[PDB]
Design a protein around this ligand. Structure first.
Ligand SMILES: *Cc1c(COP(=O)(O)O)cnc(C)c1O
Ligand SMILES: N[C@@H](Cc1c[nH]c2ccccc12)C(=O)O
Ligand SMILES: [Cl-]
Ligand SMILES: [Cl-]
Ligand SMILES: [Cl-]
Ligand SMILES: [Cl-]
Ligand SMILES: [Cl-]
Ligand SMILES: [Cs+]
Ligand SMILES: [Cs+]
Ligand SMILES: [Cs+]
Ligand SMILES: [Cs+]
Ligand SMILES: [Cs+]
Ligand SMILES: [Cs+]
Lengths: 256, 394
């Protein structure tokens, strides 16, 4: 979680927002996915959110459903995803890396063991998509024992009790999906929550700037990156060019 | 559909190809949002004070009115950073571009002042700036082209049409239609398609707000009239806006009369043109009988444009503002008079406004009147122009 603390301190000093792309690991293959992720970083991503393909991604809409299918078609497994994570961390020592996981993949071989593997490869946070705060105890506990930030979603239908739990329980950042927005953001700060990243349908530069203006620490593009991969499957080179240009533009919007 | 009224009576509108409408709608939305955002206002105010130097002086000019019953003040936009009022609105537009998450600026320029203003605002605020300028204007304005390059802008000569300001104006719009996702078009006057006449007015309206406070402090009443030159309309609407609802205050805009209205060599479409549609707006313009856009002329490149912003056409139509013209010779006499009597070198653009105020005084020297001229810019840039005319003249 320390990489996030360092990142947000750096951005705060520059009066700048964070821009964080999501991609599915191994979409559309391992080699291309590694290149995609390097492109995202070189173009100015501040952190990554990386999904491990799961058979049943309940929290995910059609774009990410299709990305999971492409990765499975390429034979991607969680073991291969952890190999990729080691390679990414090896090339990029400071960028915060967050995983988007489904509960079964974390519980499968033991929750403690999963977080220990995260710590060993150099992952910084884990968001378990189908674990609400009410069910979160063993996940958050194992995360913190292994120096992993447990990331929680603050949904649009969040009440005060939930804001307080997410503020207490989370580290790294709060994943905001958005009570009025100003209220959610104010309350999270009042409750000393992890800095908020707005993740609701972020697909254009102006949305990044608006998120920062609203008081959020930055924005997460939950599917726009994946859409670019999907739109350009037939041409890997053009895919990278379009990713670089998009991330470039989104990051530019976060600058003071 | 729009958030704000695109028209001033019958004038104005959004006469652009369909592909540009999302750009104009996005900008209008960002502007409406910015105008309700105290943080945006505070940022803009901070740049205007600490970078550009606002508030500007209001100077009482005693020598030039001596022995008449005119009291003349000059609002000193010539003291703003950059040497003209253009700096006010380029700072606001640069802030809007950043609000929208844009990293790049496109601008047109004729005289080159707007190019320089766009470039300096871009330099300060970390935006990548490109400027379009008719090839004829490029050749005429080597000092300004060099300034733009020093400030890190790219200058792109325009060879289409008449290779002058209107052609630069068209090319800026052409570029933006392709680039608006990443680039903001920093239009240089209170004209063009909505929302620009409205944005530029609001980002220049501090001129009249300061003038009102300053004249109240110094004279305990409002002016009898405020007088400003009109090239596209920004300095004049910035001076006029805060006085529109003070119905006793006269609003006088001065168009360039060139070699004389009767010669056809002028830039006075509001009084001597006819309504047409060009540059995204329905507005008075100089045009041929068959509806081609005419070439304007003024000694002052800053006033040399064959149309005018739509709010001025509207204020004239309802009789709220009165529009007059001043010839090259009248402007040159005012330029000389201000240098000699007050030690201020005015822009030849501003000299048209001063010339008309001098005419108001001289025609009726026993009329009691309290006048403010918007001195929109300084005239160091004009000394070569003025030298050359005086020499030719003998
Ligand atoms: C550009 C300029 C003008 C004319 O433009 P408006 O938009 O009509 O104000 C007038 N005076 C100066 C000094 C200028 O630089
Ligand atoms: N020619 C002047 C003023 C100007 C800029 N853009 C305009 C558009 C219309 C009329 C005048 C202008 C300049 O470039 O500094
Ligand atoms: Cl999610
Ligand atoms: Cl406000
Ligand atoms: Cl030079
Ligand atoms: Cl007083
Ligand atoms: Cl009056
Ligand atoms: Cs916390
Ligand atoms: Cs001052
Ligand atoms: Cs006097
Ligand atoms: Cs911004
Ligand atoms: Cs004009
Ligand atoms: Cs001209």
């Amino acid at each position: 979680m320390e990489r996030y603390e360092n990142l947000f301190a750096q951005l705060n000093d520059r009066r700048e927002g964070a821009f964080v792309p999501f991609v599915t690991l191994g979409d559309p293959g391992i080699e291309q996915s590694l290149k995609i992720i390097d492109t995202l970083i070189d173009a100015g991503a501040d952190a990554l959110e990386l999904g491990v393909p799961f058979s049943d991604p309940l929290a995910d809409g059609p774009t990410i459903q299709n990305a999971n299918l492409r990765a499975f078609a390429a034979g991607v497994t969680p073991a291969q995803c952890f190999e990729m994570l080691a390679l990414i961390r090896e090339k990029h020592p400071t960028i915060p890396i967050g995983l988007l996981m489904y509960a079964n993949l974390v519980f499968n071989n033991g929750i403690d063991a999963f977080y220990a593997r995260c710590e060993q490869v150099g992952v910084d946070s884990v968001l378990v998509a189908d674990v609400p705060v009410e069910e979160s105890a063993p996940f958050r506990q194992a995360a913190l024992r292994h120096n992993i930030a447990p990331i929680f979603i603050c949904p649009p239908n969040a009440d005060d009790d939930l804001l307080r739990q997410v503020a207490s329980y989370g580290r790294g950042y709060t994943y905001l999906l958005s009570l009025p927005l100003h209220h959610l953001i104010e309350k999270l700060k009042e409750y000393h929550a992890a800095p908020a990243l707005q993740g609701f349908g972020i697909s254009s530069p102006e949305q990044v700037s608006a998120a920062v203006r609203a008081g959020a620490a930055g924005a997460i593009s939950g599917s726009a990156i994946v859409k670019i991969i999907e739109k350009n499957l037939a041409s890997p080179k053009q895919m990278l060019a379009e990713l670089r240009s998009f991330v470039s533009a989104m990051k530019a919007a976060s600058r003071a | 559909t729009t958030l704000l009224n695109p028209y001033f009576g019958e004038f104005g509108g959004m006469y652009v190809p369909q592909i540009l409408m999302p750009a104009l709608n996005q900008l209008e939305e960002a502007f409406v949002s910015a105008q309700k955002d105290p943080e945006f206002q505070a940022q803009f105010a901070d740049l205007l004070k600490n970078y550009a130097g606002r508030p500007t002086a209001l100077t009482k000019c005693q020598n030039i009115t001596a022995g008449t019953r005119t009291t003349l003040y000059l609002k000193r936009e010539d003291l703003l950073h950059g040497g003209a009022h253009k700096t006010n609105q380029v700072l606001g537009q640069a802030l809007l571009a950043k609000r929208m998450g844009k990293s790049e600026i496109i601008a047109e320029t004729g005289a080159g002042q707007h190019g320089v203003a766009s470039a300096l605002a871009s330099a300060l605020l970390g935006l990548k700036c490109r400027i379009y300028m008719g090839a004829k204007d490029v050749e005429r304005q080597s000092p300004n082209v060099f300034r733009m390059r020093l400030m890190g802008a790219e200058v792109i000569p325009v060879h289409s049409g008449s290779a002058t300001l209107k052609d630069a104006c068209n090319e800026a719009l052409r570029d933006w239609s392709g680039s608006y996702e990443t680039a903001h078009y920093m239009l240089g006057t209170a004209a063009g398609p909505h929302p620009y006449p409205t944005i530029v007015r609001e980002f220049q309206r501090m001129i009249g707000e300061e003038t009102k406070a300053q004249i109240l402090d110094k004279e305990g009443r409002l002016p009898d009239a405020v007088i400003a030159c009109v090239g596209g309309g920004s300095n004049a609407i910035g001076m006029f806006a805060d006085f529109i609802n003070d119905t006793s205050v006269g609003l006088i805009g001065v168009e360039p009369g060139g070699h004389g209205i009767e010669t056809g060599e002028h830039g006075a479409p509001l009084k001597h043109g006819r309504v047409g549609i060009y540059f995204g707006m329905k507005a008075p313009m100089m045009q041929t009988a068959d509806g081609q856009i005419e070439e304007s002329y003024s000694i002052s490149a800053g006033l040399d444009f064959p149309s005018v912003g739509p709010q001025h056409a509207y204020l004239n139509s309802i009789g709220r503002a009165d529009y007059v013209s001043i010839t090259d010779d009248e402007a040159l006499e005012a330029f000389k008079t201000l240098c000699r009597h007050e030690g201020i070198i005015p822009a030849l653009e501003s000299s048209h406004a001063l010339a008309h105020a001098l005419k108001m005084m001289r025609e009726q020297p026993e009329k009691e009147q309290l006048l403010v001229v918007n001195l929109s810019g300084r005239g160091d840039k004009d000394i070569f122009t003025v030298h050359d005319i005086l020499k030719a003249r003998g």
